[PDB]
Design a protein around this ligand. Structure first.
Ligand SMILES: *[C@@H]1O[C@H](CO)[C@@H](O[C@@H]2O[C@H](CO)[C@@H](O[C@@H]3O[C@H](CO[C@H]4O[C@H](CO[C@H]5O[C@H](CO[C@H]6O[C@H](CO)[C@@H](O)[C@H](O)[C@@H]6O)[C@@H](O)[C@H](O)[C@@H]5O)[C@@H](O)[C@H](O)[C@@H]4O)[C@@H](O)[C@H](O)[C@@H]3O)[C@H](O)[C@H]2NC(C)=O)[C@H](O)[C@H]1NC(C)=O
Ligand SMILES: *[C@@H]1O[C@H](CO)[C@@H](O[C@@H]2O[C@H](CO)[C@@H](O[C@@H]3O[C@H](CO[C@H]4O[C@H](CO)[C@@H](O)[C@H](O)[C@@H]4O)[C@@H](O)[C@H](O)[C@@H]3O)[C@H](O)[C@H]2NC(C)=O)[C@H](O)[C@H]1NC(C)=O
Ligand SMILES: N[C@@H](CCC(=O)O)C(=O)O
Lengths: 211, 137, 32, 111, 337, 48
């Protein structure tokens, strides 16, 4: 009866309960892999942790920067500005290093930079939403013909694949990856533990149940 | 990146075999004593500057910002005088002739200096540290 | 809402109900 | 999924597997259909039978996974209401509180 | 452009009046309309809006233009608002404002779970537990001390299914275009079924494609279609594979569609990065104030609101067996050794 | 079983000294919406 039970379990009513236990095991193993942990992330600038910040969630930006100006000259961004104006860093590097060393909870900055830091570092991920769709330009002193020349040159640069190659050799040159598709493959650690347990039981069985 | 022993940049190529160019850029070495030393600038804005120098034939002397910020206006120490600090602060003072850098095109700065067509249509997002990943019946 | 299922340790849950029905069927197969 | 394409492909591959097994031997049908639906041993083609069992297990796993995959207005701020047309017709009760709500409001004119 | 209100005889709602040529009255709304109203309320100037009756966006016939740009350079209209792509060509005769909407050229088309160590660990465990022993161990892996090894194998099956499902819920593969730097569009006659893709004539995308890749414009010379909606319907029908068109328009169209089958190429990348703008008279005095106005709209954040008001969207094996046959041929060579 | 302080009661519920907590609807909804983690939740779909 032992060989029958252990044979049916490890592959009429007992076979039904065995098939049910196997199906339940497979279903639970699928549910504990296809899904994920409770959602905990920043949904953009409209996130409640930024609207009414505290000592728990500390976020800022680069001191004396475009973000600083953006948060400055606006009435509905008064609280956020008042909050950031006490944690701002002198450079972007120190801020990234801060949010990397778990000093900051968030860091407002350019997408062309933050999405680049998510390409050269898997521990740093950009937020959800995107605001202030501006752009980077060439600084020109007052009204100068060099402004028109440079602007025409940039227009001609975008006209072809110059900026495309400039992006493919600097921006698109990502070293890391994107975990948008979270369950990539099965962890080898679990299979290692299963192999350890199986080989252990097989060893103990070959040392006891053998003779 | 810091210069070599004789003031030169290591000709590092890309993965496809592209010789990345570099230009000598004088700036600060580093609660912080003032010190001006030449360094090696290389990247997007540098290649773009090389392209602009290729199109419009003009010699250039690349240098870094005296401070660590970009360009924001601020009140003076006295008499309430609006003065810009940063790269724009150097551009208005005549210390600089052109800002080739991640310079956001906004309303406040445009009222003093002119901007060209956006060479990088970026935006403003948030950077956050990722969470914890890391036969058990 | 992702975790592990243990089906608790109380009341009349699954499997045990099937074992009970099998026990009744066995009671009807042993008395025959 | 994949309709009768992958089915007839796996079927022709099964017939080719039985043909290759018969060519390696000199029964095979019972082995192929037996391994597929869950039997000569050895015959210098047992490895091909193991590979066929692997392909069968992979087919079963793929079928189960695909069977599990093919089984398992955003409010007032919906774009279908912000800029309506003759396609998305919506309204309310004439002379009601909703009517009053949408009436006296500058940003709720269009609706 | 919506028709005027027949219940009054004039333009209704928050729409602005615009003529269309001997010209009829028509109401105008949308994104660039709100932008125009905002900058008219900022720069403070009265404006007479009207639809162009000579061409569309802007092209170059012989030596003169025949679009909105032509309407500007011919002193027939001071400014030009709407979907107008900025390039080096148009910016030569007229001027452009700071881009309020970023766009460009884009296209809109219609064993993995098991780790590499798992395959070696299974073969190593089968070697430890020969002759028929290997066949029994590998046979029990699929579908009395071996019983335990069966139990584990059962688990190994469960995971092999579970993970697979996960691997089916993770990866979202799609027939994405390999870009403009690919041979998939540079050589449509190379493959067996000729990829049918085209664009609109007299456009900025058509003027940029012919100046970046002659082959594209050469092949799309007969694959060109008139009308964006007609092109979309051609995509839905099956007479057209992909569509090369403006980025913003394609994004909105992908967001707002009768169904949800259409989607931009890639995650949302755009070749030839540019942006919409406002074409005004060359060497004018409004360029400065207009730029300051639009940038003020950027700083205020109203641009995001207007982008969420109008541009808002509602959408968005056997080969291994063949290798076994090669392994069977290698095993057949050892049998006759 | 009366407890003083809403935060203390929530901390007691997170500790295990309190099974449930009967309190104002809005405060509990906000507290469940915004917390240190995502463990606390209102009874039912949102009945009051
Ligand atoms: C993108 O942009 C391109 C252009 O850049 C657009 O293409 C134009 O599209 C329009 C609309 O489809 C085309 O116009 C069509 O033409 C066809 C065929 O021609 C019709 O009209 C001609 C008239 O020309 C003849 O006659 C004149 C003069 O007539 C007589 O008297 C003259 C003086 O009194 C004298 O000088 C003449 O000698 C003559 O005796 C001649 O000058 C000319 O040589 C011709 O003989 C008729 O002859 C035809 O029978 C026919 O009716 C029409 O069928 C259509 O109705 C429409 O009018 C235009 O040709 C296109 N141009 C080009 C260059 O392609 C695209 O449409 C744009 N795309 C989008 C999406 O907007
Ligand atoms: C970053 O910038 C800093 C600038 O503030 C750099 O600091 C400087 O570093 C140098 C190198 O160590 C310091 O030492 C200098 O040495 C020279 C040489 O004279 C000596 O050697 C001769 C023999 O060759 C000997 O006969 C003399 O008696 C001296 O012993 C001196 O001339 C200088 O005065 C100086 O001592 C500098 O002191 C230091 N400058 C400052 C202002 O601190 C720093 O090196 C830079 N870092 C990098 C990585 O480049
Ligand atoms: N945006 C283009 C028209 C649309 C297109 O060519 O994709 C223009 O202003 O010329």
């Amino acid at each position: 009866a032992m060989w029958f039970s252990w044979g049916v379990l490890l592959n009429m009513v007992w076979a039904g309960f065995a098939m049910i236990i196997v199906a339940s095991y497979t279903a639970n193993l699928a549910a504990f892999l296809v899904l994920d942990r409770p959602e905990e992330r920043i949904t953009g600038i409209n996130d409640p942790r930024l609207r009414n910040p505290s000592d728990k969630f500390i976020y800022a930006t680069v001191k004396q920067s475009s973000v600083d100006i953006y948060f400055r000259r606006q009435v509905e961004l008064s609280t956020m500005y008042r909050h950031m104006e006490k944690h701002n860093y002198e450079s972007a590097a120190e801020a990234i290093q801060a949010v990397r060393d778990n000093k900051l909870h968030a860091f407002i900055w350019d997408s062309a930079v933050l999405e680049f830091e998510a390409s050269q570092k898997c521990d740093l991920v950009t937020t959800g939403e995107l605001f202030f769709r501006s752009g980077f330009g060439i600084g020109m002193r007052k009204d100068s013909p060099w402004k028109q020349q440079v602007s025409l040159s940039i227009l001609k640069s975008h006209e072809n694949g110059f900026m495309e190659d400039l992006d493919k050799t600097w921006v698109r040159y990502q070293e890391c990856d994107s975990r948008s598709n979270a369950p990539a493959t099965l962890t080898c650690e679990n299979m290692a533990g299963v192999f350890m347990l199986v080989a252990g039981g097989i060893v103990a069985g070959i040392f006891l149940i053998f003779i | 990146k810091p210069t070599m022993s004789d003031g030169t940049c290591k000709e590092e190529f890309t993965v496809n075999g592209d010789p990345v160019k570099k230009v000598i850029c004088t700036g600060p070495n580093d609660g912080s004593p003032r010190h001006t030393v030449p360094q090696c600038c290389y990247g997007f804005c540098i290649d773009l500057l090389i392209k602009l120098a290729r199109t419009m034939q003009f010699t250039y002397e690349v240098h870094l910002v005296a401070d660590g910020k970009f360009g924001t206006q601020e009140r003076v120490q006295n008499s309430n005088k609006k003065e810009w600090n940063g790269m724009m602060g150097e551009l208005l003072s005549g210390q600089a002739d052109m800002i080739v850098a991640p310079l956001t095109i906004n309303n406040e700065r445009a009222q003093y200096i002119e901007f060209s067509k956006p060479f990088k249509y970026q935006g403003l997002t948030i950077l956050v540290k990722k969470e914890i990943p890391r036969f058990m019946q | 809402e992702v975790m592990s299922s243990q089906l608790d340790c109380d009341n009349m849950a699954g499997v045990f109900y099937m074992l009970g029905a099998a026990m009744a069927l066995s009671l009807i197969t042993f008395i025959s | 999924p994949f309709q009768s394409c992958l089915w007839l492909l796996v079927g022709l591959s099964v017939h080719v597997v039985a043909v290759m097994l018969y060519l390696l031997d000199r029964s095979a049908m019972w082995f192929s259909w037996g391994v597929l639906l869950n039997a000569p041993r050895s015959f210098s083609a047992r490895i091909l039978g193991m590979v066929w069992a692997g392909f069968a297990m992979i087919i079963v796993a793929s079928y189960t996974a695909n069977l599990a995959a093919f089984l398992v207005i955003t409010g007032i701020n919906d774009p279908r209401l912000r800029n309506p047309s003759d396609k998305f017709i919506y309204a309310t009760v004439k002379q009601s509180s909703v009517d009053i709500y949408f009436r006296r409001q500058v940003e709720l004119s269009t609706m | 452009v919506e028709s005027v209100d027949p219940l009054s005889g004039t333009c209704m709602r928050n729409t602005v009046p615009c003529q269309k040529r001997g010209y009829i009255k028509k109401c105008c709304k949308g994104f660039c309309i709100d932008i125009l109203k905002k900058i008219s309320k900022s720069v403070k100037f009265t404006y007479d809006l009207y639809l162009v009756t000579n061409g569309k966006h802007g092209k170059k016939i012989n030596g003169t233009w025949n679009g909105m740009i032509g309407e500007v350079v011919m002193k027939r209209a001071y400014m030009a608002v709407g979907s107008l792509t900025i390039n080096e060509e148009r910016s030569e005769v007229v001027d452009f404002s700071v881009p309020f909407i970023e766009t460009g050229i884009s296209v809109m088309v219609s064993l993995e779970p098991f780790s590499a160590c798992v395959w070696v660990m299974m073969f190593v465990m089968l070697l430890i537990v020969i002759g028929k022993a290997i066949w029994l161990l590998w046979g029990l892996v699929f579908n009395i001390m071996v019983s335990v090894w069966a139990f584990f194998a059962v688990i190994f099956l469960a995971s092999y299914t579970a993970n697979l499902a996960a691997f089916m819920i993770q990866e979202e593969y799609v027939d994405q275009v390999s870009g403009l730097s690919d041979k998939k569009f540079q050589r449509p006659n190379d493959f067996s079924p000729p990829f049918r893709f085209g664009t609109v004539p007299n456009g900025s995308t058509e003027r940029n494609i012919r100046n970046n890749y002659a082959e594209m414009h050469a092949y799309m010379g007969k694959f060109n279609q008139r009308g964006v909606d007609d092109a979309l319907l051609s995509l839905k029908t099956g007479k057209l594979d992909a569509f090369i068109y403006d980025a913003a328009v394609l994004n909105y169209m992908a967001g707002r569609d009768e169904g949800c089958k259409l989607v931009t190429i890639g995650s949302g990348k755009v070749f030839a990065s540019t942006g919409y703008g406002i074409a005004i008279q060359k060497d004018s005095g409004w360029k400065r104030q207009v730029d300051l106005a639009i940038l003020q709209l950027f700083g205020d954040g109203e641009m995001e609101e207007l982008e969420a008001l109008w541009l808002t969207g509602i959408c968005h094996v056997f080969y291994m067996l063949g290798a076994a046959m090669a392994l069977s041929l290698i095993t057949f060579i050892s049998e006759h050794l």
